[PDB]
Paper text:
Here we identify and characterise a sub-family of multi-centre photoreceptors, termed photocobilins, that use B12 and biliverdin (BV) to sense light across the visible spectrum. We have identified and characterised two types of photocobilins, one from Saccharothrix syringae (SasPcob) that represents a standalone photocobilin photoreceptor and a more complex protein that consists of a photocobilin diguanylate cyclase (DGC) fusion from Acidimicrobiaceae bacterium (AbDPcob) that is representative of a photocobilin domain fused to an enzyme domain. Crystal structures reveal close juxtaposition of the B12 and BV chromophores, an arrangement that facilitates optical coupling. Light-triggered conversion of the B12 affects quaternary structure, in turn leading to light-activation of associated enzyme domains.
Residue numbers in the entry: 6 to 216, 221 to 346
The structure:
């Protein structure tokens, strides 16, 4: 009687169909049967969300489905979290998404698991500016701040926000997909203490030791990518005009989508360079190829843009390595698909 495997399928069906009654009731029945709340949130809800991500990437997930499924998940997490909340005896943890980060569900799961272990949690929500977060810490003096980052493109900003929080004397936890496999990009930056899940985060806070770091060498190549972003986007676009025939026939909507995506390409290259890990840019490029291909856009367009960006930045040595690796990963992806 693998109740978890059965539950996983039932929840996914409810989310995909927008059935809020079935989803919330399933969560309540699991708790009725003594299934731990952190199991419901991590092995069921989080897992269903991963699969939704896969459907979305493959262009099999509508706007209407996003709203319905996210709203239901908010309700599930709220009901489970409140039900399993323990007496707030241990202290106070502030939880926040980075500025420009709208993936609040992972952070809310962290918040609820912590409540379930006796922490008072203030959840400051999605996209919290440091200008708001830092004063909050200085006057409330929580035992810890937990910063969530899901998008690797947010890593440079993460590094800044972490440092600003540390300057308050507040111990910093970090997590989310944005810090990469095994938190490798958290470790590169020496950013707070990373943990893979809410359960692991709570376990960290049970350690008796309870887990101003100078090393931050100037990165001029990173700064050049920020400063020259529009130039690089334009070079991308010009190369696509020349060498990517379908672009000539694009309406305004499609030119705008192209410009947005070119901007993201530059931003992910910047993040890659910032943490000195071309694998960031590599995995981003091959992911982009799948995203575009599933929407009828030839991923050969990406090679045209990357090659053009590479010409402009050919005298930027680290950056041209990142670009080489991206284009190489793309080529291998397109041969091997
Ligand atoms: C739902 C969703 C959205 C929702 C989020 C709504 C909300 N309230 O959260 C909305 C619709 C807003 C959205 C928008 C976008 N998203 Co989205 N989406 C997702 C999705 C499907 C699930 C998110 C989720 O619930 N995760 C919950 C579970 C799965 O997360 P988890 O990692 O197990 O959580 C644990 C750890 O992260 C850890 N943790 C997290 N934070 C912290 C903090 C601390 C301190 C600690 C210790 C631990 C910790 O603990 C958690 C709990 O155990 C994911 C797919 C995915 N794989 O995550 C994408 C995904 C993250 N989204 C993606 C994208 C691209 C987007 C958009 C850019 C798309 C667009 N619109 O152009 C935007 C960007 C918004 C932004 N600026 O942030 C991509 C990103 C890939 C990339 N980096 O390039 C993903 C991976 C989907 C995909 N397969 O392509 N998204
Ligand atoms: C280099 C050449 C290049 C071209 C020519 C390009 C074109 C391009 N991308 C599109 C959509 C898209 N492109 C993306 C890609 C992303 N969304 C994200 O959040 C992130 C980070 C990415 C990846 C970079 C998505 C998600 C869509 C569909 C979503 C939408 O715009 O509604 C579309 C519209 C598809 C359609 O509806 O007809 C076009 C024409 N993108 C390129 O990168």
């Amino acid at each position: 009687v693998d109740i978890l495997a059965a539950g996983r399928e039932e929840l996914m069906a409810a989310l995909a169909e927008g059935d809020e009654h079935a989803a919330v009731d399933l969560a309540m029945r699991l708790l009725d049967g003594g299934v731990p709340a952190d199991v419901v949130l991590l092995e069921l809800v989080a897992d269903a969300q991963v699969e939704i991500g896969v459907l979305w990437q493959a262009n099999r997930w509508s706007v209407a489905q996003e709203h319905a499924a996210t709203a239901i998940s908010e309700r599930v997490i709220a009901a489970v979290g409140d039900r399993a909340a323990a007496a707030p005896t241990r202290g106070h943890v502030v939880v926040a998404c980075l500025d420009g980060e709208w993936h609040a569900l992972p952070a809310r799961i962290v918040a609820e698991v912590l409540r379930g272990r006796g922490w008072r949690v203030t959840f400051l929500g999605a996209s919290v500016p440091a200008a708001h977060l830092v004063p909050y810490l200085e006057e409330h003096g929580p035992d810890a701040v937990a910063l969530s980052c899901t998008l690797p493109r947010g890593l440079p900003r993460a590094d800044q926000v972490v440092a600003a929080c540390r300057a308050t004397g507040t111990p910093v936890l970090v997590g989310g997909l944005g810090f990469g496999p095994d938190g490798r990009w958290a470790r590169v930056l020496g950013a707070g203490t990373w943990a893979p899940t809410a359960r692991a985060a709570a376990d960290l806070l049970d350690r008796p030791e309870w887990p101003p770091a100078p090393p931050r060498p100037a990165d001029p190549e990173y700064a050049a990518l920020r400063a020259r972003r529009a130039e690089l986007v334009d070079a991308g676009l010009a190369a696509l005009h020349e060498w990517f025939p379908p672009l000539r026939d694009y309406d305004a909507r499609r030119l705008d989508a192209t410009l947005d995506d070119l901007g993201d390409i530059v931003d992910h290259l910047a993040a890659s360079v910032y943490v000195d890990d071309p694998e960031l840019f590599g995995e981003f490029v091959t992911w982009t190829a799948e995203v575009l291909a599933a929407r009828g856009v030839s991923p050969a367009s990406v090679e045209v843009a990357l090659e053009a960006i590479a010409r402009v930045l050919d005298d930027h040595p680290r950056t041209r390595h990142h670009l080489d690796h991206g284009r190489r990963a793309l080529a291998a992806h397109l041969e091997h698909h």
